[PDB]
């Protein structure tokens, strides 16, 4: 009978530094003898003994013979794998979990939830599945690729919630958030405030009664969406974050958009899951937050600071931490989760590091890891090592 | 010292959707570098923490060098393999059971029973392994192809029930069932009723003391024998199902079969193991069925359902749930299984999907998982993805 | 602290019946993706709760590029590997545990012991590992070869046995055996009797207190030399198997050896490892030999029983119990083992199935599985399936 | 709650002996279907229950398309992989660790703990990992690539201590000693004595409180920096090997470096990490080194005893105890590292085989191991078996 998991205060330290790269394509050459799954979208989920390296494969290996859909998004194909933390993703060694082109997982601290999306644009579906029983679903309420988080969902005392978006890319997508409990849903939260456009929410605990989520808007911003769930009410509201570090991609000169907090400024269609993690600390609480260097490409990617304060009214800029990838790589998807040692959480960073090469060739990403030890400053930036043409 | 199984209650539900899909050929192209296995007649048995792949390799992968004969059913090769659900069957990846060509597991919650069935055609044989021992064995008593279920077998208090059938293909074919517990048969069940044809039967568990079994016969009728099994008094008897629904391939217009339901109708030479599963309510029961699209070849799949009544006398046609394949895919064998979740089971239905490119090339097949979560309507279809020409 | 394993009374049980077959060159075609290990001398060893399958690797796989001196027995890079019964022994699936050409292992029932043998051929040397240290050694004693039984060795009450052997091909090798105990041996049997040549003994025991062994004379005989050790008193004899069923290879005619008892007969150069296990009854005890179907070449394998006795003295034949393999099929080495089910041992006997296409091309071996399970008679036969032009 | 480990009287023995070889290359070849790792500097650490076999590979498997750089030592793609002891270390079957171009790894008897070292060659950075969770770092103190002792290191009480080094290959380079425990850094320990180059420091447990290191001077001696840490005062000194058996490589005939035990002789440029263990008898003391055979090149490689003594003031020559390996094979690195059995400790020296053929082609190397293992001498010779060309 295992315990209900809590977040806890986070291991001592000041800085980020390389952990650990998962290059599954450094093993698939012609001439190698590996079948490293084509892959997006991944993150990692660490329960109390384990941590687990989440993906969405397009069930194609390279070498292969099925490059074709691989860069779409959605399909029939699409399935949620992972493995454990350090073992490359191959054929063999993942393991399917569900039919998915979106989702999630979580563990409450005694079992494993996967959260997987699929179904038609119009109807999309979520399933719910704890450990190998399939549990239950929620149905696309906007009727417009219901789609979720793309990042570990957060438990606590068996309560797991995470967020879901229906809506259009370009135009509206009211989140909701779903509390679920051994696998079914119990509950709902419809958030108040700024929600014309959040997804891809990157939540993490701020506190035992807190939830946080730096989130993405596709369409009037490039500003943030900010969440901030209060597990004890079950009540959600976003407000954009007001610094001018602007974390979302494309974005304009930091700083560059005038008016009060609130302002969208330019639209600046587009957008990217972005990290970001908390650092809980006695009496101070350290935010950490990802975002490319280019301004209006997915290359590099740098690491932001800000310790205190209230990021839906703060217009003080991050301090940046560091740089963990170069505009000469490709810095996606980053996303955030916590290693649970001994008796405090580790609270890390993780970049998705596409390996994009056009639409006539393989499309899959490595996964870089960068994690909070000990002090002084981020030391090394990660490459994926990786060339396409082998 | 573990616990007997017993089924319960089904979990909250009251439609199917996509769950999984196992396309082990998704990676065995030319210029790939996996070995997936060259399997038919794939179904999977559940216990109290993990489920498995069971299939019926003929001992070969693709690519590979031994195409010739898989096509075959009956060889002294053929082997019954397994993986835990959600793994590819690769060969460094399954594990060999034992030689034969027809089976099937079941685990009666405190180990596995495997069976199998080899031997010459004239006197096959069928063996019981309980867990690494071989532990019993029966005789073919018609002398003609002994064989067995093809899919999961059923414990109930450390009391697993199979069925099996000695008989021609085209002719007689009186199904017997091998009460058996930790390995050994214990008694054998003679039905009664309509017993000219029954095989294959896919049996499950309708309540703590019955058994149904929708199976096949190959020679009289369009309709599906149907098996009521009562553990109680150890006796069981065998009717057609009376519904104008036909579930069997070949088979003519629904309700097109005049007569009274024992009515056998046009021959319609021919058929195929059908899935089927029960959804146990507090006062209700849901019967679930599947069978394909077309009514002539083993192409797409329908789910099918209808609570409560007596599928021995009810003419009343079943309620189409959705379509699960397109008559665009192949679909072969369909099973039923029931996952075991904390305190409910959920009932699924998974599909066998032949990649059949005449009998001068390899021979295998997918796996399509259906299962009963939440409500609304089924909304994906399920495709394999393979080409064969790969 | 499990318990020490003793010998208990065989299963129910009258005949053989094939079970498994591990054809790891099944899948090592130039076409296919596995790395299948070239092996030779396999043989089960079973545990409380799992059957391993040994066997001596020349630490190079097919296809590959080292098939040179594949034939040859001895060599600097022999290493003994094993991987759970079920799996097929690829470069990724084993575990290689010493460097070896000779060698045998047994479970005492708390952990496994394993047993090497290498080093100079005057000067070979037995190495003991229990579970992960080395433990001890044996020296050679007639500086010729030391050897090893090829099989499971025997343990009881944490006391294993193994046959050792130093000595001349074509001349004399006077075995002997050590007691083994938490991996250091703790006294050595010096046997008496007919002691001019035993070797590649397949022992087990008859009873909790005795073990046989039916062995091999490469030079004086085609009959078997016949163990007999008295675990109690730690002492054992060696008299020649009466029966006219001689089961080494080469032979004469069954019963063409006159004289007594004793009697060598013709030298018949050469000999094999021969199958041999124990059916321990109530108050029988039934004796299973295995032994090829031609009398000159390793082709083809049948089954032999003869009940209680002494087969140091009846002339009587034995009782052909079936063909496991037939003179079209390459049947070599034959070893027994016995798998633990719940209150009782199921008795096996494993037959080495190798590939020989000469000593310009790999030299592999499939391992194929009869135990005794139920009645009736051996019903089916074994092959290898395996095309070495692949 | 498992108990924290302590060194332990050592197992009865006199002798070493080959005990296992892991030439992963051996299926590495064009035409073969395996991914072996392309590593370097491996060596071997023991746990209660299990060893593993770590490595610093190149994120590059053979046959593969990245064998450039693979003889550097220093990038940012190298990580610290392992397998358990008897698994050939493949894409599939090790785990990556953490990124790392320099490491070690020890067992408190609890739980694992992995330390790497990369960052930029002015800054590098010392990384703790305990289990999952990285808890801790070293920064650069003579910023001059700071490295690691490319071995085991050494638990007691939960106590580990761990050797690094800052400074210049040719010039100073003094070392230091963490003491850790749980992963992080409690202590450091800045030892006295010859301290101008101390590196790659081959640790071990002489008792329960002193634990001495045969090390690697690049600059100024062949003669080995020798230090003794008392565990007990947490203070370290270092003095040179008297002995007129040299270790390092390359190094003048034995015994040709006149003056006193401190005399350094001449610098003769370069060193390389040498094998060294402790066998504790209840009141002997024997100690294992390892050193090539060539006194200038890094081929074959001969076992040396001496027992009891002062190293830092014997001038007396070891005891050759025999050839692991020949003239004819490489000999690089030597580690130490005590498998734990029962009651007692096994003392075991790896050595590193590289598989050198330039810097044009890939660079690799095998691993093999010889541990004490009852009386006699040591008997055979260690070869990788591997042809570079295929
Ligand atoms: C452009 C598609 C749109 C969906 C409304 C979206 O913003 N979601 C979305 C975007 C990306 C990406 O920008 O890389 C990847 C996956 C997505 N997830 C899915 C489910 O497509
Ligand atoms: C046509 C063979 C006949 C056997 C009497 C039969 O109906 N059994 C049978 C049929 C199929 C199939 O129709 O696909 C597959 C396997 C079978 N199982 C076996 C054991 O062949
Ligand atoms: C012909 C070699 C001789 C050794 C004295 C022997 O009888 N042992 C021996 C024989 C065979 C075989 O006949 O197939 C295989 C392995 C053996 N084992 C070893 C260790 O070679
Ligand atoms: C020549 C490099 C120098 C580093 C100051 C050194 O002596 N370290 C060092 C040497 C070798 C070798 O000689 O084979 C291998 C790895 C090393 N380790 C690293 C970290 O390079
Ligand atoms: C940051 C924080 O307070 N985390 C808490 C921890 O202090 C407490 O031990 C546990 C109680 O449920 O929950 C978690
Ligand atoms: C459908 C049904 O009644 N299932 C039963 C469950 O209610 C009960 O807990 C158990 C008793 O043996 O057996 C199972
Ligand atoms: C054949 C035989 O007697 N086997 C015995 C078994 O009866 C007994 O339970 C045990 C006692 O040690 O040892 C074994
Ligand atoms: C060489 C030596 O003394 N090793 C000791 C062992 O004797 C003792 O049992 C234990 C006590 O902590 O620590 C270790
Ligand atoms: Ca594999
Ligand atoms: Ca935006
Ligand atoms: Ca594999
Ligand atoms: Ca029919
Ligand atoms: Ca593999
Ligand atoms: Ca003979
Ligand atoms: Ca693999
Ligand atoms: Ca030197």
């Known amino acids: ?35 490293p799954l084509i892959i997006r979208e991944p993150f990692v989920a660490c329960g109390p003994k384990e941590c687990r390296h989440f993906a969405l494969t397009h069930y194609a290996a390279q070498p292969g013979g099925y490059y074709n859909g691989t860069r779409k998004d959605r399909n029939k194909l699409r399935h949620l794998v992972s493995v454990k933390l350090g073992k490359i993703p191959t054929v063999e060694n993942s393991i399917f979990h569900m039919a998915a082109w979106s989702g999630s997982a979580c563990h409450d601290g005694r079992e494993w939830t996967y959260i997987g999306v699929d179904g038609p644009d119009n109807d999309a579906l979520v399933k719910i599945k704890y450990g190998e029983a399939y549990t239950d679903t929620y149905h696309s309420y906007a009727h417009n690729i219901l789609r979720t988080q793309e990042s570990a969902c957060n438990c606590i005392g068996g309560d797991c919630y995470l967020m879901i978006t229906d809506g259009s890319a370009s135009g509206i997508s009211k989140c909701r958030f779903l509390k679920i409990r051994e696998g079914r849903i119990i509950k709902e939260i419809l958030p108040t405030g700024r929600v014309e456009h959040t997804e891809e929410c990157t939540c993490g605990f701020a506190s035992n009664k807190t939830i946080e989520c730096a989130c993405r808007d596709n369409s009037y911003t490039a500003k943030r969406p900010f969440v901030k769930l209060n597990v004890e009410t079950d009540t959600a509201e976003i407000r954009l974050m007001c610094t001018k570090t602007y974390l979302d991609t494309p974005r304009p000169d930091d700083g560059s958009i005038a008016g ?78 916590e290693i649970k040692d001994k008796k405090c959480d580790v609270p890390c960073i993780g970049i998705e590091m596409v390996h994009d090469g056009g639409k006539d060739t393989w499309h899959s990403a490595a996964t870089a890891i960068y994690c909070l030890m000990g002090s002084g400053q981020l030391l090394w930036d990660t490459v994926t090592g990786v060339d396409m043409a082998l």
Request: proline content about 5%; hydrophobic content about 30%.
């Open 1 to 35: 009978e295992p315990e209900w998991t809590y977040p806890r205060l986070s291991c001592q330290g000041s800085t980020f530094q390389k952990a650990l790269l998962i290059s599954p394509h450094r093993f698939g050459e012609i001439k190698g003898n590996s079948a």
């Open 260 to 337: 009060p907090c609130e302002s969208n400024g330019d639209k600046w269609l587009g957008g990217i899951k972005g990290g970001f993690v908390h650092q809980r600390m006695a009496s101070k609480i350290g935010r950490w937050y990802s975002r490319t260097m280019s301004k209006t490409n997915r290359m590099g990617m740098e690491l932001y600071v800000r310790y205190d304060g209230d990021p839906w009214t703060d217009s003080d800029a991050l301090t940046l931490s560091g740089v963990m990838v170069s505009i000469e790589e490709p810095g996606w998807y980053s996303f955030g989760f």
